[PDB]
Design a protein around this ligand. Structure first.
Ligand SMILES: [Ca+2]
Ligand SMILES: [Ca+2]
Ligand SMILES: [Ca+2]
Ligand SMILES: [Ca+2]
Ligand SMILES: [Ca+2]
Ligand SMILES: [Ca+2]
Ligand SMILES: [Cl-]
Lengths: 452, 453
C-alpha cells in the first residue's frame, strides 16, 4: 500500500468510542490476552510479572513473577511469549518464552538465551508452579526478539523468533541468519543458531513435530523462514495463520503463514519488486569503518556488496498480503522534519501485534472478518478487512484511535463492543503534526475503548 | 514482479521437450480441451467450428459449426466460451458463448450481443443438437471480449466477460463499466449493460444463483467485478478459482477469484501502489478532441481527469497474486527496439489463458501445484508454482518454450508428460533479440510437447 500522510493519521480520532484508562505506569507491558476465566491477563516484559485484571471491577493481582528474566534498559529482551492451553479447564497450562542467562556462553556480545517454558496453574493457591523447559538454547539479543507464542487448532505451539537485529545498527556486521537452516549435525547437537527470523512449530512437550516441513532434507522445529521482526501471529477460526512483521525503512507486512514458506527477508522486503529496497550485506563489507547510509539499500556507501530483490536465488518465496508501506526508489529517507529520530518519518507503521476480531452479541457494525494491528510509531490501531475465508485482504489498513502513544497489543471483549489496548512505558511516536515526541499521553497503560 | 529482459526470454527454449506440430493453418484456434471421450477438442473463433483431434493419429474431424457466429477481421469477437458438462455420461451437454447479431440494437457501432448457449451431444449422429440460449443480450464489441466458460465443482457456470475495450483505442470515450453494477429494475428487465469487466456465476439454466454475492445491495449473475480482459479461468483440485488477466501498458495479473471481490479495474491496475499507472477517464474529458498519450496515465494530455490508485474510494478491493509486470513512474513506455509496434515492448506478457496442471502417472518432476499461463506477445508459456493449498504463489513466473509464436491455450494429457498448445494464425510477437515480427513460426497450430529427462 501507499503511505498515509501525517494529516490522514491525525484525523483517525474514533469519536464513536469512549476511552477509559484501567491501569497506568506498568513496567513495559507487552502481551495481552482474554483469559479462560473471563479476566484480562497481561505481562510486564521487564519484570517477568504476569498480571490478571478483573474487567468488571478493575482490581489487579500479580499472579506470578517468572524468576531470573534478563532485561536490558536498551533492549527488547525479557518476558516475551505468553499463551494459555486451548482446553484450560481440562489442561491448566501457561506457555511463555523469556530471556535468561546462558551459562555456557563464550561470546560476551551474546550472553543470553531464549527459553520456551511451560507452567501449571494451581487454582487452590491461585499461582503458577512446576516449570517445564520445552526448548532452550534459542538465540537471544537486544533487538528483533519478536516472541509471539500461540497454540494452533492442531494443538502445536507456533512461535515467532526474530532475526536478532543482524545487518542493522549495533549488529550491523553480523551475518543475517533468516535464510539459514540447521544441518542434520547441528540439529542432532541441539545447536539452534539458525533459529533466527523463523516461525517455529513445536509439539507441546517441545519435541519436533513428525509432520514439520523439511529444509535441505532436515526436519527441525522450523515451520517458515525468511522473517525480520514478526511481532504479530494469530489463527483465524477456519485454521489460517495471519501474521504482522516489521520491515526496515519500508514494507512492514501482513503475511499468510503457509507450511514451509520462505518469506524472503533479508533478500526481499515486501513484494519482489525492486522498489525502494535492495539487500546490502554488511557482514560481507570490506571493513567495519564502512557506514550504513540508511537508504534501505537504494543507495549504499562504497565497500558493501548489494543485490536487487529480483536477483535473489531463493526458493518457495511467499509475498505479503499487504505492505505498510511500499515506496518507489525516488522516496526521501532523509526527512529532516523528524529531527534526529529520522526512522519515525520512514514509510512504515511498526506493527506490534495482530488480532483476529471474533465478533459477538454486541459486535461493531462492519467489523466482521477483520484483523486489528496496533502501530508503535504512528499511535494508531489499524483495522484490516479480509474476505470471510481470510484468503485475501479487502481494501486498505484503516487507522483508528490516533494518540501520542505507542500501541503494543489489542484484544476485544467476548461481546465485541469493547477493545482493550496496551501502551509502551517509553519511546518515540509521531504526533498529529508529523513531528516526533517522546512525551507519551498514557505511558505503560491498559486502556478500554467502549463502542458508543 | 519485475520484467524479464529479451535475453532471459530467449534462453527459455525448454530443451527437455520434444516438439511435434499436429495441425497448422487453423482459422483463429481459440479454446483447447481434453474431452470426456479422451480426444482433444478445440474451437475456431472466426468460423464457429468445433473440431475433434485423435491424440494417437493426429486426425481431425469438424464435429459442428455454430451457425450465424459474427466475427470481424479486426475484432476479438466470434465463438468464445466452450466447456463440457462434468458428468457427461448422464448429462451430454456442451456449453458455449458467442457473438451474434442483436436485432433490437439501434447503435450501428455496437450491433451485436453475446449469448451463452447449451447444445446436446448426440452419440449416434456424432454432432450437436437442441440449442438452448441460457443467457442472451450480454454486451459485445470488437475488443476485450474474454469469454472463458468453465463449470465449477458446485456445478454452476463461471464466465469471464471483458470491459469491451472502453477507455482505449476505438472505444476511448465510452465510460468503462467494470465497476458498474445492475439495479433490481434492470435485472427484472434482463438489461445486462453493466455485465462488462466481470466474472459471472450462473445456474445451469442461466438463472441467478440465490447464493451469489451482493453488490450495492443487489444479487445478480455477477460473482466478481473490476476486471479488464480476463482470458484465463481455472479451478484447482481443492475448489479454488485462479485467473489470468491482461492489464494495460503494465500489470497483467494472476488473480485468486474470491466471491464478491472487486478486482479494481479501471481505478487500479495490479497492486494499489500508484506505481506506473493512474486512471485517466477519457469519458469525463472536456471534449472528444483529447488524445491518449498511451503513457498508462502517468503522463496525459491536458483535458482528461486523472485519479491516482490511492485516491479511489473502493469496496472489497482484491490485489493480484502476481503481476507481469509492475514498474516505477520513471519507466519509459516508448522503447525504440519495437519501432512503430511500441505496445510489444511494454512491461506486459498478454496472458491468453490459465491452466491448472494436475500431474498424473507420468507427472513432470517439480511441476506439482503449477499454473500454466500462455503468453501472446512474448512467445512463451509461463510455469507459476503455488503452495499445495493454492493460497499463494511461490517464486516467479518461469518462461518455457520460447518461439516466435503467439501462444493461445494449453492443456496436459491425463498422464501429465505431454502438453498440447494452440497458437494464433496471425499477429505480432517479440523475437529473441527483443524486436517485433509478424512472421509466426507455427501459424494457427495445435502443437504437442513431450517431456524427456
Ligand atoms: Ca517478507
Ligand atoms: Ca520489495
Ligand atoms: Ca518503533
Ligand atoms: Ca448504471
Ligand atoms: Ca486487478
Ligand atoms: Ca498499480
Ligand atoms: Cl554442521
Amino acid at each position: 500500500d501507499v503511505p498515509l500522510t501525517p494529516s490522514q493519521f491525525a484525523k483517525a480520532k474514533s469519536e464513536n468510542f469512549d476511552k477509559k484508562v484501567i491501569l497506568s505506569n506498568l513496567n513495559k507491558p507487552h502481551a495481552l490476552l482474554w483469559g479462560p476465566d473471563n479476566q484480562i491477563w497481561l505481562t510486564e516484559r521487564a519484570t517477568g510479572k504476569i498480571l490478571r485484571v478483573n474487567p468488571e471491577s478493575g482490581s489487579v493481582k500479580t499472579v506470578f513473577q517468572v524468576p531470573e528474566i534478563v532485561n536490558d534498559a536498551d533492549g527488547q529482551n525479557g518476558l516475551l511469549g505468553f499463551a494459555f492451553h486451548p482446553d484450560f479447564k481440562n489442561n491448566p497450562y501457561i506457555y511463555i518464552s523469556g530471556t535468561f542467562k546462558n551459562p555456557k556462553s563464550t561470546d560476551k556480545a551474546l550472553p543470553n538465551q531464549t527459553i520456551i517454558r511451560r507452567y501449571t496453574y494451581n487454582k487452590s493457591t491461585d499461582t503458577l508452579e512446576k516449570p517445564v523447559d520445552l526448548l532452550a538454547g534459542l538465540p537471544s539479543s537486544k533487538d528483533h526478539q519478536s516472541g509471539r507464542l500461540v497454540i494452533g487448532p492442531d494443538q502445536k505451539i507456533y512461535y515467532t523468533i526474530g532475526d536478532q537485529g543482524r545487518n542493522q545498527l549495533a549488529y550491523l556486521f553480523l551475518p543475517n541468519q533468516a535464510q539459514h537452516t540447521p544441518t542434520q549435525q547441528e540439529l542432532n547437537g541441539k545447536d539452534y543458531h539458525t533459529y533466527m527470523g523463523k516461525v517455529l512449530r513445536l509439539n507441546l512437550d517441545g519435541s519436533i513435530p513428525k509432520d514439520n516441513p523439511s529444509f535441505n532434507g532436515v526436519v527441525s522445529h522450523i515451520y517458515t523462514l525468511g522473517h525480520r521482526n514478526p511481532q504479530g501471529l494469530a489463527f483465524t477460526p477456519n485454521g489460517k495463520l495471519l501474521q504482522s512483521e516489521q520491515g526496515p525503512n519500508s514494507d512492514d507486512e501482513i503475511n499468510l503463514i503457509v507450511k514451509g514458506g520462505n518469506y524472503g527477508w533479508p533478500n526481499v522486503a515486501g513484494y519482489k519488486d525492486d522498489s525502494g529496497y535492495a539487500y546490502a550485506n554488511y557482514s560481507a563489507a570490506a571493513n567495519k569503518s564502512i557506514k550504513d547510509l540508511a537508504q534501505n539499500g537504494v543507495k549504499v556507501a562504497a565497500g558493501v556488496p548489494v543485490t536487487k530483490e529480483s536477483e535473489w536465488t531463493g526458493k518457495n518465496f511467499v509475498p505479503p498480503l499487504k505492505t505498510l508501506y511500499t515506496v518507489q526508489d525516488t522516496y526521501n529517507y532523509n526527512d529532516p522534519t523528524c529531527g534526529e529520530m529520522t526512522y519515525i518519518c520512514w514509510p512504515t507503521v511498526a506493527p506490534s501485534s495482530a488480532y483476529v476480531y471474533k465478533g459477538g452479541k454486541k459486535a461493531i457494525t462492519g467489523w466482521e472478518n477483520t484483523l486489528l494491528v496496533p502501530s508503535l510509531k504512528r499511535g494508531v490501531i489499524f483495522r484490516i478487512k479480509l474476505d470471510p475465508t481470510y484468503s485475501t485482504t479487502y481494501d486498505d489498513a484503516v487507522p483508528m484511535f490516533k494518540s501520542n502513544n505507542r500501541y503494543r497489543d489489542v484484544i476485544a471483549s467476548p461481546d465485541g463492543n469493547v477493545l482493550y489496548v496496551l501502551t509502551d512505558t517509553a519511546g518515540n511516536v509521531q504526533k498529529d503534526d508529523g513531528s516526533v515526541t517522546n512525551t507519551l499521553e498514557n505511558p505503560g497503560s491498559l486502556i478500554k475503548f467502549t463502542y458508543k
